[PDB]
Amino acid sequence: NTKVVAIGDSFTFGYPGNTENSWPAVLGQTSQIEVVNKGLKSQTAQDLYSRFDADVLAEKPGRVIIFVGNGDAIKEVPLETFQQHIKAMVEKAESNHIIPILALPLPYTGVQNTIKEFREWESSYAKEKNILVLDFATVLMDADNVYLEGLLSKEANYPSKEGYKLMGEYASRVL
Structure with missing residues (x-):
């Protein structure tokens, strides 16, 4: 009903922090609803699709946030495969x-051109x-795809606990 499932990759698991400080947890704390975190590190849309029944269907949520594409870019999964999934x-x-609610993949330094492509297509499909869309x-x-003050974690390309907090807060306002 107001229950939500967040299915995604490392950016849903909350890497490099722990999943308990990731954006889905914050979403739930903020919106005072039940959010289940089914993000796993480095997964591609095909990986998520495969566990979609137990991870989403069986949870009987009323909404599902699908945040994927970062992993796909890292693993050179082509645009045609990402779309289909x-x-x-x-x-x-x-x-x-x-x-369903789609979360665009994020700008990521190794693969900006591929990510721009995924995001652009995903926005128009949505x-x-x-x-x-999130x-x-x-x-x-x-404007340069660089993390704002205090939002970048200790590893490049990934959000800090505050970054994840604002992501969860943004999602609570949007939803």
């Missing part, structure tokens, strides 16, 4: 009467289908 998760969610970049970074 985003589509499949949306379709199964909808077949199950679960409202727009033609009236699916709600753009975590709007609270994490500046």
